[PDB]
Amino acid sequence: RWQEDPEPEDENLYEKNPDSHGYDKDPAVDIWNMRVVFFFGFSIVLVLGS
Amino acid sequence: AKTVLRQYWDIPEGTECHRKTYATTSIGGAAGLVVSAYSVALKTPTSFLEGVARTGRYTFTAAAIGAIFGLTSCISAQVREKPDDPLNYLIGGCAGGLILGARTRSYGIGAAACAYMGLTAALVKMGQLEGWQVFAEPKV
Amino acid sequence: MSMVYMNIMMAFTVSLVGLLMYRSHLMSSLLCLEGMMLSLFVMAALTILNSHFTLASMMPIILLVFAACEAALGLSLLVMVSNTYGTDYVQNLNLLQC
Amino acid sequence: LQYGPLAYILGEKATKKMTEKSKLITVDGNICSGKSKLAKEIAEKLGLKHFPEAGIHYVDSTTGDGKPLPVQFSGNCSLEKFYDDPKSNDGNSYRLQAWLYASRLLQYADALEHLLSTGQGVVLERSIYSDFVFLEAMYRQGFIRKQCVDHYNQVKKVTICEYLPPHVVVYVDVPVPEVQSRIQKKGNPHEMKITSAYLQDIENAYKGTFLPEMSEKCEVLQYSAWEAQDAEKVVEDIEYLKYDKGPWLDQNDRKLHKLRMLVQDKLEVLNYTSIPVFLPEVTVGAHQSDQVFQEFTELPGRKYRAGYNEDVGDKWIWLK
Amino acid sequence: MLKYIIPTIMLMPLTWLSKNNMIWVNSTAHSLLISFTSLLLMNQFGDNSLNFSLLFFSDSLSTPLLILTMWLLPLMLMASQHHLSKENLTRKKLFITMLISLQLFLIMTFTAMELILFYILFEATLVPTLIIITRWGNQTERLNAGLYFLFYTLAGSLPLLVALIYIQNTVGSLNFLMLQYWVQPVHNSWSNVFMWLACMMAFMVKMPLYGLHLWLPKAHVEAPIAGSMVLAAVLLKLGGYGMLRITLILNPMTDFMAYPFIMLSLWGMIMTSSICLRQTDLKSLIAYSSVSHMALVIVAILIQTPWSYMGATALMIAHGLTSSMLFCLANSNYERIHSRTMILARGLQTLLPLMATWWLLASLTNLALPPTINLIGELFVVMSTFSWSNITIILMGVNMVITALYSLYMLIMTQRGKYTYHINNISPSFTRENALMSLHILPLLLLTLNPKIILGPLY
Amino acid sequence: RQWQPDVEWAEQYGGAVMYPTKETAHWKPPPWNDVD
Amino acid sequence: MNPIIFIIILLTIMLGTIIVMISSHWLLVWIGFEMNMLAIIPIMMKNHNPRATEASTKYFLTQSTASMLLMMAVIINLMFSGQWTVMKLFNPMASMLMTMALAMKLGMAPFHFWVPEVTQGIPLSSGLILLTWQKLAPMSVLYQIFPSINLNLILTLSVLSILIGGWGGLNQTQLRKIMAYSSIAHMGWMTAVLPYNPTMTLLNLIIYIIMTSTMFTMFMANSTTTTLSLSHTWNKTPIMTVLILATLLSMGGLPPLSGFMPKWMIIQEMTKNNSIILPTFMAITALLNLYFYMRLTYSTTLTMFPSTNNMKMKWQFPLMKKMTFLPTMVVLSTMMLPLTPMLSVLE
Amino acid sequence: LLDLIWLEAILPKTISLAQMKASTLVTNQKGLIKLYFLSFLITILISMILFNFHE
């Protein structure tokens, strides 16, 4: 039938980055994303908020 | 149309059934004729006889609904001794809906018509009791 | 009202019914449209003349001039229709059904 | 002043610029018929602008930096693949033909715009009027389906009717055995796989449908392979034409203003080349088209309207 | 409220002016900061509400809903950034913009002093919500789900508009503080019956009431994860919050008008709870669980007692976090096996030990284990409906049994038993997923230590 | 991946009407350029 | 058409409307309609094809009939009052004839049949004039004669138009016909409130014109006349699809968009007059319009329809259509709700 | 029986059918000038004889 791209294969983030936190493919961005979530989420809102 | 509606609402509910059934049948007949006129003008019948058959079919179908509603709703008010009750119109409205199912030979249309026309008649009775305005006179 | 108004009002109604009940020729419906104007011209003239409304005496002329210009436009559309199909039959003007 | 009603009102009328030399000339013929060389000579001698035949990358040549774009931005149409596998299941045969008609339509619009804006005539190699000979040949060899032909005629019906035909049609008549001889001599590996039957169908369409049709409305000049070498004689024939037929005689400043308003707006020119007719050969799925379009926007000088691309050196953008 | 409206608006220039690779980092960080400042709304008094201005006020009802709303935005960004990774940059920013605009409407909706202002913002939330479902939903049926969601709401909300305008003509104001003092009793009449229905049906459809709930399982099965989170956590509570406010001006007619809707809710919760035992799609099961939990809230609101209003508020907050957790847990399985079928992937506790703990904790809150705020809210409702009529305890008790059965059934089927042999892509839980789960359960369980802040004005 | 309309879905909106009946079975989509 | 002639014909269309709006004499009102109708026919015919000739002829017959009925009402009014002042009429038969004549000119149901056919048969720019500017002159007459209009007649015309307009649009795939039926429904809102507060009629008319102009302009920018053609916009001008989505949701009356405002204020004015059943019926019936607006958004913006290979050739050329006032019109079409109290300028 | 059938039937499923049927009545017109102007005559007559809008 028509001209359509094939379905891509789902990529496991751990292949390229075994240390991946699951936020981003870029390891530097991935680590920063983990840090803001953990710092502003747990250290600030949950601890100081509590 | 204002003269017939004046006659119908002048009679007390649950009394003078034959007069009530005549007003609603004539009202139903008028609506049937109006529908037939537009139907014949906008959808040309194949022949003169086919146009007459369609006009009678719609007109009788509409007068049949108007008669059953008037008769059934007037008996319900008489039998129950409940004149100012919307439930009588709900019973009369659903009865007319069933006729439409029969005349259109269908069970879904009859059931749908019973509920929608049954509710509409009940709402009409409430508006008469509570003075609801459909075309309200400008006041402010 | 005066007796003449009966027939002049009737003439407008006859031409209005004629206009609304088409047959085949588009020209025939244009004639009914100009008949309507004619009855309007006569009724307006009678009212204005009888009441001695002096300045309104020009109004029927203005009505006549503008209505003739409208009729000229209608005739132009009729010939364009006739050029397309070879007749002025209104049954041919049904492409915009779909 | 960019052309428009205001420019037209102020005296930019076509009849001013157009002379008796303001002629649109098209050269036609079979494959390897020598039309390319004849077209250049005619243009040189008459001082006309020459348009090389519009191919798969004609549109790229008129936009951006003018260089051809990758193949995915033309749909992966390939003339080479057409010779290698004319019956390929991927629909390349008609996808190419539909793309080539749009390319020719664009070039014809460019040629008319040049003629109407400058007054200088043009020479084209084939046109939207003769493009169908390839489609008929394709269909008769069983390379495309009947539904492809129906699609082609729909697009042609609503596009070709907007434009005026050439003033002069020049046909070079080389027989099929000679064409095949010239194809093998040219030595292009893919072209040599052409069948004489395909070439005979091209000629049949040319002589059966094209030339008789254009004769009713154009000046049709025919030459053999030998007669086409004498370019001067061809140009002598052109200069002695009477121009007593065709709709170019009915044209006037009013009608040519509407025509110039059309050919200058290329999106309006190509409007009906993408009619929503879901033919498998030309239909592109949403995911592919979306992906390809994002790639196109990333090409140099293509993200923004021309003149607003800082990555290719445009300046004063904050005042433009 | 401008101290929350403006920084919420500023999230949009932040997302659009961020570096291409920092849109998730920046939007998540700053929406967590906004969530932090929202705790200042806890300045609540025993007698008076916190009346900021002519447009906005906060009280003990809207304050917990406001804090839940602003907390959910960073959680939604965390949950969405993975399945949107392939999406092009401009469309990623448009998605985040729809989430931000949803929060802006929500915080204004919950603090609007005037009821017609509440209406417009209450209606505005449809637009971004519909866009999120239809544009970024995965399957063909998102288009139908969008329509059912849109037209169920408008079928009820348009009559509410007429009723609200009618009330303002009669009373002269729709300011909620004014109505507290100028409220007059609603007398029996057919006009007042339909005024009552117009004032209530829109909120019933959103809750959703049993019989008007069929749009909700559709919406969830088709929505992306963030759509499901905001739908379950907050958007359902627009109905409850609306009902809690408007019932002020419907007395004493609510005494008898509530009967059909109490019957639908009381019987509805047992039906929907029973339905959960047979659901084959995990998202659909969680969706039906919401209908059952919110049937309790409808009953609580309709019987109008201090205990029922306190229980209704706690239930709305507790369910918001629990149902959002459950959707996030189900989504994390979907991102691996790409199917919502509950029976497809079994025995996941063997492969994902820590994720099975989150599954256990979420299930325990769903069945209302004491002393979670899920149980506190449910218990307060059960206590108050017992006084309303002692027989309700039988229906309330049966639902508690069925709720435990389907909650543990969902846990047992997906986490226990034997793993499915051919499913060999169950990769270890990401830090993002674990953090997302804990950002639901931890505030939920911490609220047990100070429940008063989620008990509402009647506390 | 996310479903997007295919040719089957899109052809639902390419007819003369949205709801074909016996009356309109003969209707055809008008010319692309309005010219008959 | 010669560009200078096209300008003079456009100015005559405007002048005819202006004459209707500034006249105190009934004859001048009639002249304004005659002049306006004469000048609009050439822009219906400009593309010279049988469909454009049929549309121009169907339009001419309808408008000429309506103008004859109008002149009858004027002459009957003269007979029974001896004056020509444009104001309330002095005879109920004259009022019915003028109301029916103006309903015919506006294309209100059941005099609506010409609107979808004429709009379909003329170019987009001509349809833009037909469905916006042409509403001004008849509505301005209704603004002045409304005290003498039969309430039952006008409200019946309004209710029918809202039903016919809503139902008629459900079956349409042609954009011009969708706009035509959408126009019919919106006229019903304008006349339903006229007996109660003409100011709200003006508000609805102005906002309707703005959103209608926006949609026609966006259709013209892409030369789209069918749903399927419009579904190719995402693969050419993605911004345009977002603007179309926002405008359609506004024409659907969804808060917080501008198109909620006229429906909101009409419901208020009717309820102040103890009209509850009618506004509620109108609001629920307007959901029919929202349905087929939403259908367009699905095929244009919220899903990506299949494309064609030749579309790639379009990626290399920019939009060169004027799109005059489009950025302003789209912002007014969607973002005006916070300024609703500004409606008092129309008082 | 209830949540996938009858609660569907009594409202969204039946309501959509009625509108679709009503739309086909309104739009299935023959495009004939004669039939449209004939309906205008019926409308004007009905407006007077039935509803007395001329009073």
Ligand SMILES: CCCCCCCCCCCCO[C@@H]1O[C@H](CO)[C@@H](O[C@H]2O[C@H](CO)[C@@H](O)[C@H](O)[C@H]2O)[C@H](O)[C@H]1O
């Ligand atoms: C799905 C629902 C669809 C829409 C349903 C709409 C329901 C609208 C309610 C019907 C209108 C109200 O009903 C109307 O009320 C007024 C109030 O006196 C009555 O008015 C009547 O008053 C007296 C009797 O009291 C009569 O002598 C007089 O002839 C008449 O004017 C009307 O005879 C009645 O028909």
Ligand SMILES: CCCCCCCCCCCCO[C@@H]1O[C@H](CO)[C@@H](O[C@H]2O[C@H](CO)[C@@H](O)[C@H](O)[C@H]2O)[C@H](O)[C@H]1O
């Ligand atoms: C759609 C039909 C198109 C063709 C129109 C044909 C022309 C119509 C001519 C109308 C002129 C007559 O108009 C009519 O005259 C009579 C004469 O007093 C008026 O008077 C009549 O009604 C009023 C009521 O208060 C009183 O004067 C009196 O009861 C009665 O005589 C009517 O109020 C007026 O409506």
Ligand SMILES: CCCCCCCCCCCCO[C@@H]1O[C@H](CO)[C@@H](O[C@H]2O[C@H](CO)[C@@H](O)[C@H](O)[C@H]2O)[C@H](O)[C@H]1O
């Ligand atoms: C007087 C009325 C006008 C008021 C205008 C006030 C603001 C004017 C801003 C002018 C500068 C805009 O800057 C222009 O847009 C963005 C943001 O900077 C930049 O491009 C952007 O790409 C991506 C986001 O898409 C990011 O990496 C980053 O945000 C930026 O690099 C352009 O490279 C720059 O040329």
Ligand SMILES: CCCCCCCCCCCCO[C@@H]1O[C@H](CO)[C@@H](O[C@H]2O[C@H](CO)[C@@H](O)[C@H](O)[C@H]2O)[C@H](O)[C@H]1O
């Ligand atoms: C009581 C208050 C709320 C009432 C709300 C009711 C209003 C209507 C809501 C749904 C509107 C959806 O509008 C339309 O509905 C029908 C089914 O109903 C959908 O159609 C769907 O069901 C029908 C009937 O089984 C199937 O034939 C069809 O294949 C399927 O797609 C349409 O694709 C949708 O466009």
Ligand SMILES: CCCCCCCCCCCCO[C@@H]1O[C@H](CO)[C@@H](O[C@H]2O[C@H](CO)[C@@H](O)[C@H](O)[C@H]2O)[C@H](O)[C@H]1O
């Ligand atoms: C409480 C009042 C609420 C008022 C809300 C009004 C909502 C109006 C919604 C649009 C109605 C028309 O919507 C249209 O309905 C029909 C019938 O269901 C659907 O039609 C679909 O279902 C029918 C039923 O089996 C199938 O035969 C048909 O093949 C299928 O296409 C259309 O796909 C849908 O586009």
Ligand SMILES: Nc1nc2c(ncn2[C@@H]2O[C@H](COP(=O)(O)OP(=O)(O)OP(=O)(O)O)[C@@H](O)[C@H]2O)c(=O)[nH]1
């Ligand atoms: N399928 C297809 N091929 C085409 C079309 N136009 C050109 N071609 C091919 O492009 C190639 C070059 O065409 P020609 O100009 O005729 O050959 P040429 O030898 O280079 O030029 P001449 O010497 O003048 O004959 C040939 O293989 C043609 O078949 C077309 O419209 N469709």
Ligand SMILES: N=C(N)NC(=N)NCCc1ccc(I)c(Cl)c1
């Ligand atoms: N005819 C109507 N009911 N409406 C109407 N215009 N009433 C006049 C009352 C009014 C309202 C607002 C303003 I500001 C002003 Cl100055 C006057």
Ligand SMILES: [Mg+2]
């Ligand atoms: Mg060559």
